[PDB]
């Protein structure tokens, strides 16, 4: 049940973790690609309260909301269909099985390298059931020029 067009110019993402340089690389990519809206709609960091992080839309300062819980991020942002999971190797399994409980997410990007192969097969099995594309683990992600890039893919601007 996998889709063909994973990413478009209206694709929104939720980034799991404090990767502010990686998220700013996405918003630098979007403005140069002449997008209307930033790719990152929210960020999820479980070790701090809900606040807003200041970023750039080119030369203009915007605020991207940070959520302690994933359920607060998915409820307040129903237009998000991509999760970019920057969790570590010992925490990416629990974050990816938690985000498959939300039907809006169609693509999951797992950046961590060092996840056990037995735990990765359970990620593959549940993504096959839910029809969710997984790019990873142990990837930088991917880039679709003009539309969307995943995290740190392609380097700096």
Partner 1 sequence: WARELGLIRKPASFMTSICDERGQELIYAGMPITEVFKEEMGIGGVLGLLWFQKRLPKYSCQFIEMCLMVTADHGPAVSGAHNTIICARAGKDLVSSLTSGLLTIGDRFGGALDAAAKMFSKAFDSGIIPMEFVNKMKKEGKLIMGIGHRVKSINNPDMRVQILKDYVRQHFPATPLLDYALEVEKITTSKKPNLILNVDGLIGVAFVDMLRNCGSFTREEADEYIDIGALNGIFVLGRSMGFIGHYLDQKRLKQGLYRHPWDDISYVLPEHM
Residues near partner 1, by CB under 8 A: 46-47, 49, 51-52, 54, 56, 59, 61, 68
Q: Which H or E element spans position 125?
A: helix 117-130
Minimum distance, C-beta of residue 29 to partner 1, in the bound complex (Å): 16
Nearer to partner 1, 20 or 139 (CB): 20
User: In this complex, which beta carbon is closest to partner 1, that of residue 63 or of residue 138?
Assistant: 63
- By beta-carbon distance, which residue lies closest to ligand COA? 113
Distances (CA, A) of 43 to 15, 51, 120, 131: 5, 10, 24, 23
Residue 44 binding target from ligand COA, partner 1, none, CB below 5 to 8 Å by type: none
Measured between alpha carbons, how far is 148 from 68 in angstroms, rounded to an integer? Answer: 25
Q: Please say whether the dihedral angle defined by the alpha carbons of residues 76, 156, 133 and 135, taken in this order, is positive or negative.
A: negative
Residue 22 has a CB neighbour count (10 Å cut-off) of: 20
**68 binding partner (options partner 1, ligand COA, none; Cβ < 5 to 8 Å by kind):** partner 1
Partner interacting with residue 140 (select from ligand COA, partner 1, none; CB below 5-8 Å by kind): ligand COA
């Amino acid at each position: 049940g996998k889709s063909t067009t994973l990413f478009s110019r209206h694709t929104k993402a939720i980034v799991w973790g404090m990767q502010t340089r990686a998220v700013q690389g996405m918003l630098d990519f979007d403005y140069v690609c002449s997008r209307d809206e930033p790719s990152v709609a929210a960020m999820v960091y479980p070790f701090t309260g809900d606040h807003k992080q200041k970023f750039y839309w080119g030369h203009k300062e915007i605020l991207i909301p940070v959520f302690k819980n994933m359920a607060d991020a998915m409820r307040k942002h129903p237009e998000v269909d991509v999760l970019i999971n920057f969790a570590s190797l010992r925490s990416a399994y629990d974050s990816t099985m938690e985000t498959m409980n939300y039907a809006q997410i169609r693509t999951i990007a797992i950046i961590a390298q060092g996840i056990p192969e037995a735990l990765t097969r359970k990620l593959i099995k549940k993504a096959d059931q839910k029809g969710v594309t997984i790019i990873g683990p142990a990837t930088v992600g991917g880039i679709k020029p003009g539309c969307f890039k995943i995290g740190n893919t392609g380097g700096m601007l």
